[PDB]
């Protein structure tokens, strides 16, 4: 199993040009499914399955949650800035929260905030208190615990968040469980006296994947360079791995690609 629901909020003083100062996007199992920003002023579906399995009051309510959060975040930006004796400039509040459903049936919850890209405050593991990462968050810690905020977030994370995640996973079961095969290409580059072999996987899903370079049978990917897993625009992923080879010895290298969508692991040589 292992499903996830995540919301991430960005509130910035300096978006900037033609960009919304406030944004919230939601992800299920690592895939964007809802979106809200201060320009649209509306929560909006980003997958067909969320749009198909909700009614108008879902979007109207979420929209208003976002509009209210938008105001709350406007104020909180001002408050944090003041705690930092900041008078202007680029500053950002980020929030991350959500829940995991592991394939035990066990649950996990997270709620943490950053300020200017650094930890500011977070609800701790037991969800009974908040932990200030910086002295500037101490007063907030105090106010929240005096207001029973930990209890409130514990409730959302363990009940509301989880219950809704179960619905989302149900709604997009087919989409989330689909498989798409990557088209693989190996390409050879030469600008110096060093041969750069590249292997790219295009449009694979799900996310997990293995791409490696072998030098006549032996993974010689101990010195292969990966650009990691990066996203396409259509809900699939891309990855590319290179390796430097002595001119000559180009016919000794093979890229091997393992992925859940494949009939068998792909194995590809370079040929000019």
């Amino acid at each position: 199993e292992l499903h996830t629901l995540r919301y991430i909020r960005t509130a910035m003083t300096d978006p900037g040009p033609g960009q919304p100062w406030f944004v919230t996007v939601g992800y299920v199992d690592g895939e964007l499914f809802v979106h809200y920003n201060s320009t649209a002023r509306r929560y909006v579906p980003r997958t067909e399955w969320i749009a198909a399995n909700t009614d108008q009051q879902y979007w109207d309510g979420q929209t208003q949650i976002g509009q209210l959060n938008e105001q709350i975040n406007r104020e909180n930006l001002g408050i944090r800035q003041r705690r930092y004796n900041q008078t202007g400039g680029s500053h950002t509040v980020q929030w991350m929260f959500g829940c995991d459903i592991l394939e035990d049936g066990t649950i996990r919850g997270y709620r943490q905030s950053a300020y200017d890209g650094r930890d500011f405050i977070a609800l701790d593991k037991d969800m009974k208190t908040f932990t200030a990462a910086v002295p500037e968050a101490v007063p907030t810690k105090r106010k929240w615990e005096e207001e029973s905020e930990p209890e409130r977030w514990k409730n959302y994370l363990e009940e509301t968040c989880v219950e809704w995640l179960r619905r989302y996973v149900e709604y997009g079961k087919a989409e989330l469980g689909r498989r798409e095969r990557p088209e693989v290409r190996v390409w050879g580059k030469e600008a110096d006296g060093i041969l750069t072999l590249s292997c790219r996987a295009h449009g694979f899903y799900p996310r997990p994947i293995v791409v490696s370079w072998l030098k006549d049978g032996a993974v010689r990917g101990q010195d292969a360079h990966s650009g990691g897993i990066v996203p396409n625009g259509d809900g699939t992923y891309h990855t590319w791995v290179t390796i430097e080879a002595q001119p000559g010895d180009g016919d000794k290298y093979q890229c091997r690609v393992e992925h859940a969508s494949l009939p068998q692991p792909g194995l590809y040589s370079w040929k000019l």
């Binding site: 991430i8 960005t10 910035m12 300096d14 978006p15 900037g16 960009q19 944004v23 996007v25 992800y27 964007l32 680029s90 950002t92 980020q94 991350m96 950053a114 200017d116 890209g117 650094r118 930890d119 088209e183 693989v184 290409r185 390409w187 580059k189 590249s198 790219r200 295009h202 449009g203 650009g227 990066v230 996203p231 396409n232 625009g233 259509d234 891309h238 590319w240």
Partner: protein, 97 residues
């Protein structure tokens, strides 16, 4: 180091006269404000979904820009990136093959 880490790649392995999508992915940067322009021969391209940004667990931001296109022969494609952590615009060229 909070400079943008950029990768340029096509949705499908690029082919002669074949419709495709050009991608530019910038990650690991802060602040969130950033300029990412897809360009064809030193000039911007056409309809560009700059739309989608998020951030990782370490709080660093990421932004994907993608646009529909057909790779023209003899043309150079690249992703021009401008960001506060950089003195001057960075140009990441796209390798078609």
């Amino acid at each position: 180091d909070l400079t943008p880490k950029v990768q340029v790649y096509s949705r499908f392995p690029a082919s002669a006269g074949t419709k495709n999508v050009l991608n530019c992915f910038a990650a690991g940067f802060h602040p969130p404000k950033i300029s990412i322009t897809l360009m064809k021969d030193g000039v911007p391209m056409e309809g560009a979904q700059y739309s989608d940004m998020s951030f990782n667990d370490d709080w660093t931001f990421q932004r994907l820009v993608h646009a529909d296109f057909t790779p023209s022969s003899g043309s150079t494609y690249a992703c021009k990136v401008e960001h506060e952590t950089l003195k001057e615009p960075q140009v990441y060229k796209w390798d078609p093959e």
